[PDB]
Amino acid sequence: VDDWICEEEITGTDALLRRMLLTNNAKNHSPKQLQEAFSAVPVNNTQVMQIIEHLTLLSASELIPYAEVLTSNMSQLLNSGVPRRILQTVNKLWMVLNTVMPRRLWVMTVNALQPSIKFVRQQKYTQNDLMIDPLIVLRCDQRVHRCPPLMDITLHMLNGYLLASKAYLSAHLKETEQTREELKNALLAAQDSAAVQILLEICLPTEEEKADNLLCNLREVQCLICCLLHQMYIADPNIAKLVHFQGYPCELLPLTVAGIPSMHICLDFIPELIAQPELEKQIFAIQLLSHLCIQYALPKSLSVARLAVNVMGTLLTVLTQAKRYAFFMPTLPSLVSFCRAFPPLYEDIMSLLIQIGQVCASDVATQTRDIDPIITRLQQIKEKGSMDPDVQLCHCIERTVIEIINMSVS
Amino acid sequence: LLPLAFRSCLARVHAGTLQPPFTARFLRNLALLVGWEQQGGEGPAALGAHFGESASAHLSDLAPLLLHPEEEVAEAAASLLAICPFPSEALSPSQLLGLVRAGVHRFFASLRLHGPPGVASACQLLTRLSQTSPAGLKAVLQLLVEGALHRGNTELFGGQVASLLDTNRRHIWSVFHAGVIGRGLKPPKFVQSRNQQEVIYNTQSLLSLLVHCCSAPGGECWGAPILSPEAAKAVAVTLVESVCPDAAGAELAWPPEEHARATVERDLRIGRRFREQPLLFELLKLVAAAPPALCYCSVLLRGLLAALLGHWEASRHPDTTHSPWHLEASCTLVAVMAEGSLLPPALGNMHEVFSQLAPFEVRLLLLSVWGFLREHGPLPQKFIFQSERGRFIRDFSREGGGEGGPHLAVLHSVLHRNIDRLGLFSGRFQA
Amino acid sequence: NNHSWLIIQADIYFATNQYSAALHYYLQAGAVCSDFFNKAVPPDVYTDQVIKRMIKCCSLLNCHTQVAILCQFLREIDYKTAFKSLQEQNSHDAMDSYYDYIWDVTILEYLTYLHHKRGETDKRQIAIKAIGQTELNASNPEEVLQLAAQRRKKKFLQAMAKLYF
Amino acid sequence: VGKKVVQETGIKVRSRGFQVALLNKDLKPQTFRNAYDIPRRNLLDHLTRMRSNLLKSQVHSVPIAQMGNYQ
Amino acid sequence: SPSYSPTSPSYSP
Amino acid sequence: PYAIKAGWKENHATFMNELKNLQAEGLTTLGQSLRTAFDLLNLNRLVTGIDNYGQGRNPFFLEPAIIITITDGSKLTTTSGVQDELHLPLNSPLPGSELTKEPFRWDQRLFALVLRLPGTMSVESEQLTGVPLDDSAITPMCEVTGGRSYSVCSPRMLNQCLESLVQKVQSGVVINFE
Amino acid sequence: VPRIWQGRDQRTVLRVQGPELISLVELILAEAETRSQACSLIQARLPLLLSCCCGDDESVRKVTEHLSGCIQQWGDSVLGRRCRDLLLQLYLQRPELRVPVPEVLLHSEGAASSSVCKLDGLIHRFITLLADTSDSRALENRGADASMACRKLAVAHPLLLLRHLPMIAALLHGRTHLNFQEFRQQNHLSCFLHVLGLLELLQPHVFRSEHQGALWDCLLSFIRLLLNYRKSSRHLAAFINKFVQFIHKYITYNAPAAISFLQKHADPLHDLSFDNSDLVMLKSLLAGLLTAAEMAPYMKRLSRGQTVEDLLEVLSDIDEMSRRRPEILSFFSTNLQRLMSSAEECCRNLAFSLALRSMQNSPSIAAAFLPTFMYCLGSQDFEVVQTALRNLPEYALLCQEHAAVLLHRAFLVGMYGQMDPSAQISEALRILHMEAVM
After folding, report:
1. Cys bridge to B121: A361, B78, C96, D35, which one at CB 3.0-4.6 A?
2. DSSP string spanning G272-305?
3. Chain D 46-65, residues with CB within 8 Å of chain A CB atoms
4. Is D13 helix (H, G, I), strand (E, B) or coil?
């Protein structure tokens, strides 16, 4: 629907500017001239700027000749120090070309956005090639991951090829008939979930970005991917359920919960996600529920939080020492979020925290340790270590209680 | 005035008020006052303050400050604890345990931080705590060695110890490989590095503290002190508890070699513990300095000897130096057994020749050691207390066959076979 | 360091339902009588009455596995209280960590059954590993079992001392 | 004498009837048939395998008794 | 109902 | 419901498969299991009328069976506690059970193979003597029903006991003499 | 930028360094200065400052002290005026800072501005809880806790409460008509004495011009109550004493406003004086139109007492008369702090109750009891720790700046010592959260 609603008249000012500026007979700007402007030894951003700015005025029908030069040279736009307006206008022109010339534009655009270290890199990514394996479009040069216009382009491509692949393999299984439908549905669900996971991993800050600065290209790409995932979840919430059952790196949970308004449906299946055997899935469920409770503080959210507290208290006395550490290290920062969402949980949260603190203290007492936290019973506050698991878990319990008390007190 | 003042100041210290600079200043000033009063001039007598008693009243309150995150407060409290007198009556078991645990933690923490120089205060505190009572002595020794052998602080003494996106990048249209075996590639493996000089002098500091805690007080103007067999026995038994589980075959009498073949797993565990932690041998010879105590390490010595016997049997090299650690461990083990009077001087000198022999010869000598210990045994009752100097002495002449007839025959045969290289060492095994 | 007065203080705390303080002072008396807990505690101090008092102290603090340990101290092991306490699930002490200190094979048998019935397979594996220890084989020579029990007793009492002092 | 059933996977979770099941013993996860049985650890590889299998283009886990019965 | 937030007005028919 | 896993109408392969996959995870509920075993053996007696009740006892109408109970020496346990004395429960009697007023029947015997293998090896020259009787709770129940218990303390003693057991299987009935 | 916020739904965040923030706030002040030749633009620009500070307590405190220095520099210039306006707006937006801010803003009239405080709704919640009560003793306990929190906020942040003065004035207006019998049974006298004490504890600021109208409304409600139930004036002896002391302070600090109120309501006062002539203090007012020495032997006996009998006797003598004269307990603070750590149960409990009552009357001295209370929590004597836990919610409600470390100590002793303080910490934390951020 994005391409169709793009065609919709907004105000008609574009027609006015068409009739006014294009009448200058500056239409001497030709694809060969644009290609020459791109291939200057210096960057020479002025000439390409003027040409593509002029091309914005061109109607979609006559803009077809410029498809080859714009797509072929968009790899050069990844270089450092390219002006933003160049990429913005390229995005606008690509959207226009997509509105009138979708399929071959997609084929040539994917062929153009190859990593380029492999040079040709199998330029035979035909229409069928992408239609069978939509994830090819994600196999692109790393620089697009922090280039918001071309990233938006790639997201459009990815959505289109997911739907195209669905219809394609449906048609293929129909014609090859001469059960398999279950395998079709499973393959489609797996493909959509895999696309979602790759996008989420793109949203992660890399090590260099890890090496504050909340306004950058990464935030723009995160917003774009969040919008696309919102569209996908609206299209099929079962994909959201499958992705969350698969889980993903918990650093994204604030980002994903804040940027995907359809995420509120997660409270429906979180009770069933909790009941999975895998410890990792339960940990992820607790973290997800904590972020949602921060976001949406609803009675159903409170009931699911009560269930979360009860299961954490339950399997506190089912897990071994190593399992206790591995489970309660990530899910303890969720308790402060639960306290923030729901004051009526203070009783159960504090009772659970006391029980786990005494269990961990006894566990510390069983074996000789380095720090011996029990004798350090009168320590002060310490805001922000390869020690043994139990003292780490005790310090984590301490920090959880510190955060809860500090936020409630102020 | 002084009890109330100390109470109020410590209460302010424990509460959020009285920030760490003033806390360290207060502790240093109180330490200065206690040390000044101990220096019995005219002024301390005239003042009549009794800083020592009032400070002693709040020992349970001062003990947590040894664990303070601020280093200056920690060392100020360490000095104050080092000099402050304990209560006239005694220390309560909770107070004694808290003081010992805080003292050993401060000892190891300051050893890690400042090295050996910044250790004197904790050492003085622990020596005093050991001197308070035998229970205090046992607690200090046990906790100190346990913290020394703990996975943390063992490095002080030379001890040992994007997915989906990248996957899509790598991925022509077939999986080729059927799957990944286990959890993918193994990690980049563990590495370690520390100056050996620092290891040596940290071990020296720990061993000096242990010798201070073990040696009896007082006295006379001449004569080196005697290591207490009770303290060394405590160190021995806690070493046995730490290294191995003390599970089976724990009686001091050694069993036949059939049992050595029947308990190879425990022996290998003991051997690996000795290989990873060089500090264990130092503690072994510390135990061996006192004669009766090394008998209680009979399980440790038996297991290590069994591991070495297995290694020498399995060894295929012609020279014994291709196995550096095992050769050194055999030499050290025999020397330690000789120090504790578990072997006669003739057997005790065999480690001098281990570096020259083939593996089967050194295995035969160690098996002769095993046979001798089967015949006589490391029984503490065999040690006769020589009241002439307050020390236990093992008499092998009275024991009968103390020279070890068959064992010396085996040793002489081994020497005679390799007489070309071992001619000069023939005198070390004379009667 | 007068163990009789420490036991009197512990009983005074126990009479007022101050179970934590009572257990603290019982452990202090035990620490007085033995050289810390290196030696075995004399029978006339840790009598069956004192050990039962410690049992009830641990039970009222929801340290149920600790009750399971102390049940072995008695002249005859009180399997009824130990089994009734291990059935609890609101434990405040690290249940799996204390399975090293059981030396009686029937206590561990009940433990393995309980974990199997409730489905916690991993703790059942820990219990089965504990049973499978060679030193705990019930048909060992008597002094071997006695020494294993003694060392586990020492380690457990030292852990309790570190926890409560 | 047959009793072809296994132990209940429940937990009897307490509010101190929702329960968390144990490991699905003998489940035989139909990874190709169901997309929820694919771990994130190996999502892409199984995706490729099921894609290739679906086009025109559990085994080798036989019991030990039936492993070398050549007859 | 993923297209409507839980704190949005409900269209009662 | 799960105690019996190889009853009647079960082939040898099923027996072997069940025997391999045994997990030691229950209580030492010796009495209830022994009652289950005796009820299983006496399941078919009344329907075929082998026990001629009220018509004398026929030694030629016998279905010879022996129960070889292999167990350790540890005391009996139940969820309530340790029982420390073997008691057969009679909570749900099989129909017609009161006619014999004893679970074990005329042609049945119970041989206990009490495993007492020590953890650490203890070589003893006393092992060369004959297999001794065990002191556990199962020994009186073995004695009353014509059988006897065995206390093996080494693999060779286990082999000797199993050799003795094979010689002790023979079709016959047990009579108390006076 | 719309790209940064694309996909958001605009419902319920950047970091900058110190000197950059100082430059930004000085730039805001320059904009205000050139705008001067109201506070509209300062409030318009303030969201940027809050976003840039990112809720960083240290950054906000740095800006606060920098603006205080600027106000000290300029004094009362146009730049000084706009610095005061910005500082008061920031204080309203970030009132969680324990500092009540210096006297410079206590003289300004920006409290009536069209501005929203980050804490106003919460004190509104607590003042509703204070006023609304019934015969229930549970609701009376709730109202007492509400009075405690509101009083601590009064002594800590007096300006915030005075912005809500017309509200409680209207409530006082509403509650005055009800006859004496239902007034006493419904415990409305508790509400009246609570608001009267609160007004007393908002002493030097309630007499300003902006607060004058609601103050006159509250006083009108009080005098209407006095006139309507003049028959049973004897049961209102404490209320009459408190009201006359408040009138004394009113005529002392602000004589013109007090006189202007008195002439506005002269005839009710004259009629009440003629009818209730036994109000000798009222007649003394018409005419206008020691304590430490008594407690010497008590303090000496308490200090020098050793046996439990003597301590119990002196504590009971202090307790029995302190109900009549609550002000006296301020003298025995340091002396009975040492009794709170006493091993004996009875004297310790009685000392804890007396200390709690003392700091209840005077919330300022509550912070002085922090070291002894923390020592009691951490002491070896388990009875002492138990009773410290028992009184933990009350003292936590009293302090509220060291409630963080206090509850942390309580949790730590619960974690290692086997006691279960989950209930006490839960109640204390519930009240503190229901005050500070809810």
Report:
1. B78
2. HHHH-TT-HHHHHHHHH--HHHHTHHHHHHHHH-
3. 46-47, 50-51, 53-56
4. coil
The whole-angstrom separation of Cα B168 and Cα B175 is: 12
Question: How many CA within 13 A on the CB side of residue F122?
Answer: 16
DSSP of G218-244: HHHHHHHHHHHT-TT-GGGHHHHHHHH
Chains that touch C (3 or more CB pairs under 8 A): A, B, D, F, G
| Yes or no, beta carbons of G418 and C18 under 8 Å apart | no
* Nearest C-alpha neighbor of G411 from the set G403, G402, G420, G399: G420
CB contact under 8 A, A368 and B101: no
DSSP assignment of G152-216, as one string?
Answer: HHHHH-HHHHHTTHHHHHHHHHHHTSS-HHHHHHTTHHHHHHHHHHHHHHSTTTTTSSTTHHHHH
Chains touching chain B through at least 3 C-beta pairs below 8 angstroms are: A, C, D, F, G
Concatenate the DSSP letters of all residues of G70-111 into one string.
HHHHHSSSHHHHHHHHHHHHHHHH-TTSS----HHHHS--GG
Burial A21-54 (b: 16+ CB within 10 A, else e): eeeeeeeebebeebbebbeeeeeeeebbeebbeb
Q: Which tokens sit at A224? A: 């774009």
- CA end-to-end span of chain A: 47
G306 in A contact zone (CB under 8 Å): no
Q: State which residue of chain A sits closest to B242, comparing Cα positions.
A: A368
Query: Residues C131, C92: contact at Cβ < 8 Å?
Result: no
Local structure of B89: helix, strand or coil = coil
Instruction: State both tokens at D5.
Output: 């059933």
Query: What is the distance between the alpha carbons of residues A310 and C138, in angstroms, rounded to a whole number?
Result: 40
Q: For strand F65-72 and strand B391-394, is the pairing parallel, antiparallel, or unpaired?
A: unpaired
> What letter does residue F66 receive in the DSSP assignment?
E
Neighbours of chain D (3+ CB pairs under 8 A): A, B, C, F
Chain A interface, mutation test: which of C97, C114, C120, C156, most A Cβ atoms within 10 Å? C97
**Residues with Cβ < 8 Å from C65, sequence gap 6 or more?**
C86, C91, C93, C94, C95, C98, C99
Residues of F with CB under 8 A from a CB of D: 1-2, 4-10
**Rounded distance between C-alpha atoms, residue A111 and residue A124, angstroms:** 8
The residue of chain B with its CA nearest to that of G334 is: B8
Cβ of D16 and C121 within 8 Å?
no
Walk across the sheet containing F108-115 and list its strands: F65-72, F108-115, F149-152
Residue C128 touches chain G, beta carbons under 8 Å = no
Beta bridge partners, C16, equal none
Q: Do B173 and D45 touch (CB under 8 A)?
A: no
Cα pseudo-dihedral A52, A57, A58, A64, rounded to 10: 40
- What is the distance between the terminal CA atoms of chain B, rounded to a whole angstrom? 73
CB contact under 8 A, B249 and F120: yes
Chain C residues in contact with D22 (beta carbon < 8 A): 119, 121
Enumerate the H helices of chain C as residue ranges.
Answer: 3-15, 19-33, 48-60, 64-70, 79-86, 105-118, 121-131, 142-164
Spatial CA neighbour of B279 closest among B234, B312, B230, B235:
B235
Helix or strand (DSSP H, E) at F71: strand F65-72
Sign of CA dihedral A154, A159, A162, A167: negative
**How many C-beta atoms surround the C-beta of residue D3 within 10 A?**
10
Q: Which residues of B touch C165 (CB under 8 A)?
A: 93-94, 97-98
Q: What residues form DSSP beta bridges with F113?
A: F70, F150
Tell me the residue ranges of DSSP E strands in G345-395: none
Bridge partners of residue F110, in order along the sequence: F67
**Residues 371-410 of chain G whose Cβ lies under 8 A from any Cβ of chain C:** 382-383, 386
Beta carbons of D32 and A277 less than 8 Å apart: no
Helix and strand totals (H; E) in chain F = 5, 3
**Interchain CB distance below 8 Å, C144 and F73:** no
